[PDB]
Amino acid sequence: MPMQMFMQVYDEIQMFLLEELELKFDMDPNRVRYLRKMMDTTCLGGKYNRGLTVIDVAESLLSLSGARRKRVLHDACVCGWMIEFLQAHYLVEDDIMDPDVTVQCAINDGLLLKSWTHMMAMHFFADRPFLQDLLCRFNRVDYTTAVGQLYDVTSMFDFAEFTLSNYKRIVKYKTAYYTYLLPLVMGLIVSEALPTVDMGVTEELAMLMGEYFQVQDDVMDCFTPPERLGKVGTDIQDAKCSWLAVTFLAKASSAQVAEFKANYGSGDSEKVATVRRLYEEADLQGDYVAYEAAVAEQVKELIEKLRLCSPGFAASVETLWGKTY
Amino acid sequence: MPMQMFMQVYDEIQMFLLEELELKFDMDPNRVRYLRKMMDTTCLGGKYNRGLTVIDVAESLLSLSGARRKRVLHDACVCGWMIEFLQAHYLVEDDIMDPDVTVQCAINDGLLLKSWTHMMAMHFFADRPFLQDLLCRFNRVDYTTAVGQLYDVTSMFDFAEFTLSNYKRIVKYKTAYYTYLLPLVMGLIVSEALPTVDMGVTEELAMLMGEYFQVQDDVMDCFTPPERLGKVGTDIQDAKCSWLAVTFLAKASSAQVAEFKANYGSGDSEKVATVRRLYEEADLQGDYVAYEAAVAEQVKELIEKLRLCSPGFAASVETLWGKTY
Ligand SMILES: CCc1cccc(N)n1
Ligand SMILES: CCc1cccc(N)n1
Numbered sequence: 176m177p178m179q180m181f182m183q184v185y186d187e188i189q190m191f192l193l194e195e196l197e198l199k200f201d202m203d204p205n206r207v208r209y210l211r212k213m214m215d216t217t218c219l220g221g222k223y224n225r226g227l228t229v230i231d232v233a234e235s236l237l238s239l240s241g242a243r244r245k246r247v248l249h250d251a252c253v254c255g256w257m258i259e260f261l262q263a264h265y266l267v268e269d270d271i272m273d274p275d276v277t278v279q280c281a282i283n284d285g286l287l288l289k290s291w292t293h294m295m296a297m298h299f300f301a302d303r304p305f306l307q308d309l310l311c312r313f314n315r316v317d318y319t320t321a322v323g324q325l326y327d328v329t330s331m332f333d334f335a336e337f338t339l340s341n342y343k344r345i346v347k348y349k350t351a352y353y354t355y356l357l358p359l360v361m362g363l364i365v366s367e368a369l370p371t372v373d374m375g376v377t378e379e380l381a382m383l384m385g386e387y388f389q390v391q392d393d394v395m396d397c398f399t400p401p402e403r404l405g406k407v408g409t410d411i412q413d414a415k416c417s418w419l420a421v422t423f424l425a426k427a428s429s430a431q432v433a434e435f436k437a438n439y440g441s442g443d444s445e446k447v448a449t450v451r452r453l454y455e456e457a458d459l460q461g462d463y464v465a466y467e468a469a470v471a472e473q474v475k476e477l478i479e480k481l482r483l484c485s486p487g488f489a490a491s492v493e494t495l496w497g498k499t500y
Numbered sequence: 501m502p503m504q505m506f507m508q509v510y511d512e513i514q515m516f517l518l519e520e521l522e523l524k525f526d527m528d529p530n531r532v533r534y535l536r537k538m539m540d541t542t543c544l545g546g547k548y549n550r551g552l553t554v555i556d557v558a559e560s561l562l563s564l565s566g567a568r569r570k571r572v573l574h575d576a577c578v579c580g581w582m583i584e585f586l587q588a589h590y591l592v593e594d595d596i597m598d599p600d601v602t603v604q605c606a607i608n609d610g611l612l613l614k615s616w617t618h619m620m621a622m623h624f625f626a627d628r629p630f631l632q633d634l635l636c637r638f639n640r641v642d643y644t645t646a647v648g649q650l651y652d653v654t655s656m657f658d659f660a661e662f663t664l665s666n667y668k669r670i671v672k673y674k675t676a677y678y679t680y681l682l683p684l685v686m687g688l689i690v691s692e693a694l695p696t697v698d699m700g701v702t703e704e705l706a707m708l709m710g711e712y713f714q715v716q717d718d719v720m721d722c723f724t725p726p727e728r729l730g731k732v733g734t735d736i737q738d739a740k741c742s743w744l745a746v747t748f749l750a751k752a753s754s755a756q757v758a759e760f761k762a763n764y765g766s767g768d769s770e771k772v773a774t775v776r777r778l779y780e781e782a783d784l785q786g787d788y789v790a791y792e793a794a795v796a797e798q799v800k801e802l803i804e805k806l807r808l809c810s811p812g813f814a815a816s817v818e819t820l821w822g823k824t825y
Contacts, residue, residue: 200647201669205658268611271596272604274738279597279653283646286593289614290643297636307632311622318615321608322525328604333530344526413599 177230181223184252188295189214195294213284214291217263218256224498225262225358226255232362232491239487240368250365253299254309257292258358261317264288289317305364312364316357323349330416334436337421343386345416351385359492372485380477380492387470388499393417394463397451411447414440419459422466426457471500502555506548509577513620514539520619538609539616542588543581549823550587550683551580557687557816564812565693575690578624579634582617583683586642589613614642630689637689641682648674655741659761662746668711670741676710684817697810705802705817712795713824718742719788722776736772739765744784747791751782796825 193211196202202210233251237244267285271278292313300306326345330336356378363369396408397419410417420439424432435453438446454460474496482489518536521527527535558576562569592610596603617638625631651670655661681703688694721733722744735742745764749757760778763771779785799821807814 196647200644200673202647206650206654268607271607272600275597276653276657282593282596283650283653286646286649287643290639290646293639294643297639307635310632310635314615314618314622318612318619319525321611321615322521322527324611325531325608328601328608329531332601348525 177227177234178223180248181226181230181252181255184249185219185256188253188256188299191298192291192294210287213287217267217284217288218259221259221262223255223259224495225258225354226252228358228491228495229255229258229362229365231494232359232488233366235487235491236362236366236368239490240366247365247367250300250303251362253295254361254365255358257296257313258353258361260288260292260295261313261353264292265320305367309361309364312360313357316353319348319352323347323352327416331414331440334424337416337424339421339425342416342418342421343382346386346389347382350389351382354388355384355495356381359495362491363488368485368488372488373481376477376481377492380474380481380496383470383474383477384496384499387467387474390418390463390467390470391499393419394460397454398460411439411450412442418463418466419454422459422462423454423457426462427453431457502552502559503548505573506551506555506577506580509574510544510581513578513581513624516623517616517619535612538612542592542609542613543584546584546587548580548584549820550583550679551577553683553816553820554580554583554687554690556819557684557813558691560812560816561687561691561693564815565691572690572692575625575628576687578620579686579690580683582621582638583678583686585613585617585620586638586678589617590645630692634686634689637685638682641678644673644677648672648677652741656739656765659749662741662749664746664750667741667743667746668707671711671714672707675714676707679713680709680820681706684820687816688813693810693813697813698806701802701806702817705799705806705821708795708799708802709821709824712792712799715743715788715792715795716824718744719785722779723785736764736775737767743788743791744779747784747787748779748782751787752778756782 189211192214193207196210197204197207229251230248233247237247264285267281267288271281271285293310296306296310296313300309303309323345326341327349330341330345359377359381360369363372393410393415395404396410396417399408401407410419423435427435431453435450438449438453441447478489478492478496481492514536517539518532521535522529522532554576555573558572562572589610592606592613596606596610618635621631621635621638625634628634648670651666652674655666655670684702684706685694688697718735718740720729721735721742724733726732735744748760752760756778760775763774763778766772803814803817803821806817
């Protein structure tokens with residue numbers, strides 16, 4: 176029912192956007208079908224974790240606070256696709272990084288996907304009292320993500336910033352705010368129960384869940400083989416500020432740091448193996464299990480503090496936490 | 501006084517954005533100075549025609565409708581820099597088209613410039629009654645521009661679309677709405693006198709002025725030498741849907757069309773000269789003077805219809821039209 180309703184609202188959103196281009200923007204059918212195929216390619220196929228999180232938060236707050244139910248659930252699906260379209264926009268920008276008309280279309284796709292989040296919100300929420308506050312929180316989180324991207328891209332340009340506090344800064348602004356905090360907040364807005372929650376504990380939980388997700392993703396990027404990871408792990412070659420790098424530098428000897436700095440950030444298949452060997456010899460996979468266990472306890476305890484004043488809201492946070500756990 | 505006040509509000513806007521990153525987004529000084537230099541490089545140096553147009557429309561509507569004057573003029577400067585930041589955002593995307601970290605920073609610059617239009621609006625207009633309507637009209641025009649870019653990039657992919665009505669469609673959506681209609685509308689919003697104008701004649705005037713500007717720009721791109729044009733004219737090599745191309749195809753013989761199709765869209769220095777020769781032999785520069793004269797008369801007459809009900813508002817439109825004339 177959740178996934179089925181989510182995909183049913185997707186057809187409604189796509190039909191409005193494409194028909195609007197046909198009726199108001201004077202677009203020809205060849206380009207309307209072109210944009211339909213592009214919208215399906217970039218927005219459909221993932222796991223829809225961000226979008227479905229908005230629905231799970233909304234359905235809990237209406238049963239644990241009747242035509243208002245049907246409207247809130249529909250508003251959550253539109254908010255769910257706002258984030259999915261936003262995530263589609265971010266991924267398109269990633270492909271541009273890694274008279275050329277395909278690059279021209281890629282940039283155009285990114286601009287269109289971002290604009291579509293505004294267009295679908297200005298339409299389905301035209302008479303909602305929260306349209307202005309929803310767009311401001313949405314735009315501020317998008318700005319936060321762009322700032323987080325700047326922290327990540329320049330993590331090796333200005334190993335000084337290879338610290339655990341800067342790693343959390345990258346994770347907080349580039350991933351945690353739009354993946355964990357935003358879907359939870361959007362569920363509170365469509366349920367109108369925004370000021371009834373502790374935003375401090377909620378913001379704190381969103382950062383810890385994103386941090387837990389990123390550390391696990393960093394270790395899998397280095398040790399999980401490509402066919403089991405779904406991609407080629409490239410953090411070492413790209414010299415990323417991963418959890419493995421900042422944890423190695425704190426417990427390595429003065430020589431192992433020199434051997435790390437001489438082997439990190441290279442495409443040589445053996446230097447990457449030299450970095451993996453250094454990670455192995457430091458028992459980082461053992462430190463990984465302990466570091467994640469401590470984060471998980473901070474998550475388990477913070478959900479209880481949020482349950483005291485927002486009982487039903489914490490049930491969805493545990494469901495969201497289970498997807499990462 | 502107009503330019504001096506405009507640059508004075510620029511320092512105020514930049515200081516707020518950078519300090520916000522320092523105080524709220526936990527940004528280090530090295531990156532704050534990096535973003536200051538980037539903001540100056542992309543937003544400063546142009547002619548500020550879009551930004552100053554908002555000021556000229558605002559100052560006319562307050563004298564020809566007193567602490568409200570100082571607020572409206574300041575609100576117009578913020579709106580003026582919203583468009584300049586938006587134009588900076590579009591130009592950055594143009595450079596991307598024509599582990600690489602400079603391309604990564606270019607994409608990041610484009611996302612930051614667009615977000616800054618929202619951030620400066622959500623701050624300086626936080627208590628303005630038009631904040632929601634300003635962001636919706638701003639976002640819809642931005643979406644329009646992205647649609648216009650799609651019409652332009654695909655003008656030769658799907659010479660079928662090389663028609664005069666499709667040329668106006670490209671000019672209307674890609675240039676006219678955000679360069680001519682948006683600065684005029686933003687001047688009406690900060691002056692609160694939006695519903696006191698004929699939006700039909702205003703929209704019609706904005707499209708004609710953009711069309712007049714684009715035709716003149718197309719002819720100069722082909723005939724004005726590089727040192728006098730400020731750039732290398734590349735419309736023929738890029739096979740653009742220029743006014744010269746769609747006018748040639750309507751008055752050329754069946755063979756000249758074949759010679760045009762065989763020479764258009766190539767980088768060969770002689771095929772480009774063959775296309776220029778075909779443009780010369782068709783007296784297109786003579787048709788250019790006549791076509792622009794007819795557009796100018798439509799502009800002169802439409803400003804009079806707008807003066808009947810909006811007298812002071814038409815004075816700024818004539819000033820904006822003079823910059824293109
Ligand atoms: C465009 C850079 C970016 C930011 C956030 C997420 C993501 N995948 N990519
Ligand atoms: C990014 C494509 C574009 C659109 C409008 C104007 C401009 N210069 N560039």
